[PDB]
Amino acid sequence: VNSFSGYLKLTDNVYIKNADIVEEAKKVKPTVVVNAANVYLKHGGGVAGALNKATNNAMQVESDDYIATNGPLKVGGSCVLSGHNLAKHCLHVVGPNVNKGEDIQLLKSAYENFNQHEVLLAPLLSAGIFGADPIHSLRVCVDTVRTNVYLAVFDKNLYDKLVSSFL
Ligand SMILES: OC[C@@H]1CC2(CC2)CN1c1ncnc2[nH]ccc12
């Protein structure tokens, strides 16, 4: 039993809700929140910009130190950093940016990072400002993640559509 509330159950291990991941994190304070990061951990917009803003820029300060030490992530890769005031941890995951010409096959690799954590609050990866189709992203998530994932979908029309169109 966990403290996620009001989620629609999609599969054995995948749950979904029309919600802002930032608001879900502030209320639930989960163990792991997933950030839809880029390779530079430059949290400028979308999920990352909103999460970072909610941490009063502490996420960005921590991230800049991480990059200065370790260099950029790989597309499809991840790192675990603090969750600040939003969660115990933040799993920064880089999905492919198809506007950058990045291989959409890397979306499966990105979701594989979720399997290292028993329970996660997450957004759909590679969609939105990253350019990919959120319908496809949900399919890859369901077919890749085996741990318990609670997906927060920001846009109602999209949520209603992913649910109505989910097989
Ligand atoms: O797939 C992630 C969705 C799509 C978006 C890039 C346009 C933003 N996005 C979010 N998904 C869930 N919670 C959120 N809070 C702020 C943004 C956001």
Q: Pick from 43, 47, 53 the residue to mutate for probing ligand 1's pocket: most ligand atoms within 8 Å of its CB.
A: 47
Nearest to 89 by CA among 57, 122, 112: 122
Residue 128 in contact with ligand 1 by CB distance below 6 A? yes
**Own/partner pairs, 19-22, CB within 8 angstroms, 24+ separation:** 19/152, 19/153, 19/154, 20/50, 20/152, 20/154, 21/47, 21/50, 21/51, 21/121, 21/122, 21/123, 21/152, 21/154, 22/50, 22/51, 22/54, 22/86
In-domain check, residue 125: yes
8 Å CB contact between 3 and 138 = no
Residue 62 in contact with ligand 1 by CB distance below 6 A? no
Structure tokens at 161: 């559509």
Give the chain as a 3 state SS string: CCCCCCCEECCCCEEEEECCHHHHHHHHCCCEEEEEECCCCCCCCHHHHHHHHHCCCHHHHHHHHHHHHHCCCCCCCEEEEECCCCCCEEEEEECCCHHHCCCCCHHHHHHHHHHHCCEEEECCCCEHHHCECHHHHHHHHHHHCCCEEEEEECCHHHHHHHHHHCC
Apex 49 CA angle, 95 and 3, nearest 5: 80
Say which residue the tokens 């792991």 belong to. Answer: 32
In-domain check, residue 1: no
Residue 46 in contact with ligand 1 by CB distance below 6 A? yes
Q: Are strands 8-9 and 32-37 parallel, antiparallel or unpaired?
A: unpaired
**Domain count for the chain:** 1
Q: Which residues partner with 82 through β-bridges?
A: 89
Determine the straight-line distance between the first and last CA of the chain, rounded to whole angstroms.
26
In-domain check, residue 3: no
Report resolution in angstroms: 1.0
Structure tokens at 3: 């403290």
Contacts of 88 (CB under 8 A, 6+ apart): 29, 30, 31, 32
In-domain check, residue 115: yes
Nearest-angstrom CA–CA distance, 117 and 43: 22
Length of the chain: 167
In-domain check, residue 23: yes
8 Å CB contact between 137 and 110 = no
In-domain check, residue 126: yes
In-domain check, residue 2: no
Q: What region does 139 belong to: left with phi over 0, alpha with psi -120 to 50, or beta?
A: alpha
8 Å CB contact between 47 and 40 = no
CATH label of the domain that carries residue 100: 3.40.220.10
In-domain check, residue 151: yes
Q: Pick from 23, 111, 130, 154 the residue to mutate for probing ligand 1's pocket: most ligand atoms within 8 Å of its CB.
A: 154
Q: How many CA atoms lie within 13 A of 4 on its CB side?
A: 26
Approach to solving: X-ray
Q: Is the dihedral of CA 102, 157, 136, 71 positive or negative?
A: positive
Structural domain range at position 126: 8-163
